Ligand binder design. Structure first.
Ligand code: HEM
Ligand SMILES: [N]
Length: 184
């Protein structure tokens, strides 16, 4: 179960974050760890598509090769905090698993600038019991976390030393599919 009410960034700039471009997860912290494997790849695009706030997600387990994409139209709870009912799609946007009550994540942007971000997400999926996941994002898939985002991790009363890096997983991403999925 999730336990955190994450606080959104003061002065969060939604249009800059939701600009249609890709964010890569570089590091993550799962508060209920055996939620998820140690050795993971994830990325997202987020933007407005024909007036609708959207995210597209990609997950890849570099050991098992388990791969999935998702798309959601985000609903606003407050500036920088969203609820996202997702649908699993192939890379081209064809629906594999339709939107369904109880399949949603929340999404809080705790810090962002043009190149980096810190987010909190709480996943709900059927009768699974999942916990809080924090993620450090960068526009550059190879970037080491810099002082702005590491300071934001401390300001959330988290220790960056606990975050697990994605950098040694050979992650390769289809940026084109993430951008195009925003429309789907
Ligand atoms: C970047 C922010 C993230 C968001 C918004 C997010 C969102 C989601 C969503 C919506 C699903 C369900 C997809 C579906 O069934 O169609 C999912 C599943 C999953 N995510 Fe993430 N995720 C994020 C990052 C991560 C990270 C960093 C990991 C690290 C291992 C991770 C591990 C998983 C796993 C293992 C599942 C499968 C859960 C299951 O069905 O048992 N995710 N995530
Ligand atoms: N997740």
């Amino acid at each position: 179960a999730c336990t955190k009410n994450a606080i959104a960034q003061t002065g969060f700039n939604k249009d800059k974050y939701f600009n249609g471009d890709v964010w890569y997860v570089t590091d993550y912290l799962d508060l209920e760890p055996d939620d998820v494997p140690k050795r993971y790849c994830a990325a997202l695009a987020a933007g407005t598509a024909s007036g609708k706030l959207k995210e597209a997600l990609y997950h890849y387990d570099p050991k098992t090769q388990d791969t999935f994409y998702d798309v959601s139209e985000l609903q606003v709870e407050s500036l920088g905090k969203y609820t996202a009912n997702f649908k699993k799609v192939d890379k081209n946007g064809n629906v594999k698993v339709a939107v369904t009550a109880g399949n949603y994540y929340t999404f809080t942007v705790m810090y962002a600038d043009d190149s980096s971000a810190l987010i909190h997400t709480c996943l709900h999926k059927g009768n699974k019991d999942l916990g809080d996941v924090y993620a450090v994002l960068n526009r550059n898939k190879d970037a080491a976390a810099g002082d702005k985002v590491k300071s934001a991790v401390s300001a959330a009363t988290l220790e960056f030393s606990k975050f697990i890096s994605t950098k040694e997983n050979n992650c390769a991403y289809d940026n084109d599919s993430l951008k195009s999925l925003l429309t789907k």
